[PDB]
Amino acid sequence: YIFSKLCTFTITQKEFMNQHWYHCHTCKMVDGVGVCTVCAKVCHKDHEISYAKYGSFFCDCGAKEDGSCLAL
Ligand SMILES: [Zn+2]
Ligand SMILES: [Zn+2]
Ligand SMILES: [Zn+2]
């Protein structure tokens, strides 16, 4: 995919690609909902996060329609 340092939603939109992603128990982003590597570091700093898996995914942090993601 393209080079970017931002949230991978930048790359995927609501289509999917293989990537590492995380759960956030603080934000109740669990099961099939989670966050990309950038958002885990930035938007969820000091939250209770955990590794989910590597697989087909788009970032639900970047996808939040209120624009609260800090990683574009
Ligand atoms: Zn993200
Ligand atoms: Zn969180
Ligand atoms: Zn984010």
Residue numbers in the entry: 1656 to 1727
Task: Please share excerpts from the published article on this structure.
The N-end rule pathway is a proteolytic system involving the destabilization of N-terminal amino acids, known as N-degrons, which are recognized by N-recognins. The E3 ligases of the UBR subfamily recognize and degrade N-degrons through the ubiquitin-proteasome system. However, unlike other UBR proteins, UBR4, despite having only the UBR box domain, can recognize both type-1 and type-2 N-degron. Our findings suggest that the UBR box of UBR4 recognizes type-1 N-terminal arginine and type-2 N-terminal amino acids containing an aromatic ring, such as tyrosine, tryptophan, and phenylalanine through pi-interaction with two phenylalanines of the UBR box of UBR4.
